[PDB]
Each structure stands twice: as structure tokens, then as C-alpha cells.
């Protein structure tokens, strides 16, 4: 409640490339903690849809071809979400131009890489959450990840959750923290 | 010291 937490998932590809959001992710997500969920990419699987709705009072699906983008504002930050499959981090000027069309400080896109990535460029913040199911690419395995955006005033703290295999074979959830602060 | 929002880990 006192925190404003956005759950960001993308490129689920259920049931065409994956069967389910990994249980070790579901065990971390509980009702009453997430304020809003953005799902990048289509979502046609009834069980996944029902589960996501149980986790937040506000589920927004941003699809392939039913919204084409979504902007959310909290505090002084303006966060844009889109699918943007042709967008790649190796072309930050193309991503920046997209952020400038939406007039957002943070641009989140579910790029065809299916890999978590984030970077800063010209006082803006760019986030690809990867695939929450680890769904393979058409374009080194893909690894499941999702993000939480914790928005406080002019700051966004990004928490990246990733399911990674230890040397002994076990998949465990790792988490990394990145902070963006909008410059004055 | 602190945790991520979901309580998975204190950070180191």
C-alpha cells in the first residue's frame, strides 16, 4: 500500500512456447502487495489470466497487433510500456525517439531478445523485463525473469527477479536492484 | 541490510 509497486511481465507465450509462470515466481507474488500489473504481449491463457488478476487490482495487457501502448504516471515519473519487438538496446536512439513520442521518463519494452536489460540514456531509463516464462526466441538459453518497479517521487527502483540454474541443477530466484532518479 | 519488496533476500 504505502509503496507503489508495478509488476512488469512480458513475452509469456503461454501456451505456445511455455506452459506456466514458474511456481518459484508465483510463490513470491502474493495478493495485496502489487498495485498494478503490466503484461507486455498477448495473454490468451485463462489460468494465467485468472492468476494475474488475483495478484493486483489492475491488470493491463499491452499486445502484439486491446492497447498498443500504455502510459502510467506516479509521483513525477511518466512510464511508457509497449511491445516494441523491433526495438533493441543496440539502437538507443530509436528507443529514445519512442520515449519522446510518448513523453515518458521511463520506457519499458518487451524486445525480441527475451532477455532482461536496462540502461540509462539522455536522462531517461529503458527496461526490458525479459520473458517471465523464459520463452525461447525466434531471433545461451533464455532465462525466466520479471521486474518490479517501485516508484517513489522522482525515483524508480527496479527489482529484477531471475530464475537461474545452480551448478547442481537447482533453479533458484536471484534478485538485482537498479535505481533511476529523474534529473532536476 | 534491507529487503527487496517481496522479502526474498537482504541485499549484502
UniProtKB/TrEMBL annotation, chain A:
Organism: Chaetomium thermophilum (strain DSM 1495 / CBS 144.50 / IMI 039719)
Superkingdom per UniProt: Eukaryota
GO cellular component term of the entry, any: retromer complex
Swiss-Prot/TrEMBL keywords: Protein transport, Transport
Family of the protein in this entry: Belongs to the VPS29 family.
Record-linked InterPro entries: Calcineurin-like_PHP_lpxH (IPR024654), Metallo-depent_PP-like (IPR029052), Phosphodiesterase_MJ0936/Vps29 (IPR000979), Vps29 (IPR028661)
Single biological process term from Gene Ontology: protein transport
Ranges of residues in domain Calcineurin-like phosphoesterase: 5-138
Protein's name in the database: Vacuolar protein sorting-associated protein 29
